[PDB]
């Protein structure tokens, strides 16, 4: 009965190819989960990064504005001194 054996093997090949199809669909679901998860976390993080660099550029300009403010006040002491 290599004829019954052939029918068995056809069944087993159908079950294996079905299994493959399903596992491939699973893989695709994981790849989609990865993509969705990365897009979300990037959103969050790009926001936090924007806020950080804004803070940084501002505080830089405030170092400047502090020197400059001290300079302005000093020129005011210069004038006050002319008296």
């Amino acid at each position: 009965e290599t004829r019954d054996q052939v029918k068995k093997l056809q069944l087993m090949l159908r079950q294996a190819n079905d299994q493959l199809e399903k596992t491939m669909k699973d893989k695709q679901e994981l790849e989609d989960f990865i993509k969705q998860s990365s897009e979300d976390s990037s959103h969050q993080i790009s926001a936090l990064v924007l806020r950080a660099q804004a803070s940084e550029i501002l505080l830089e300009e405030l170092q400047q504005g502090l020197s400059q403010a001290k300079r302005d006040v000093q020129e005011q002491m210069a004038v006050l001194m002319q008296s």
Binding site: A47, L48, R51, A52, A54, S55, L58, L59, L62, G65, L66, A69, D72, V73, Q76, M77, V79, L80, S83
Partner: protein, 35 residues
């Protein structure tokens, strides 16, 4: 939480930007009151 503590830094930074101008004008105002 970072969104948030980045905005405490942010708020305090802006208040300080204010204080700089407050001080400079306060001084100029006082000096010119002396002339």
């Amino acid at each position: 939480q970072l969104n948030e503590r980045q905005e405490r830094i942010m708020n305090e930074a802006k208040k300080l930007e204010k204080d700089l101008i407050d001080w400079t004008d306060g001084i100029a105002r006082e000096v010119q009151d002396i002339v």
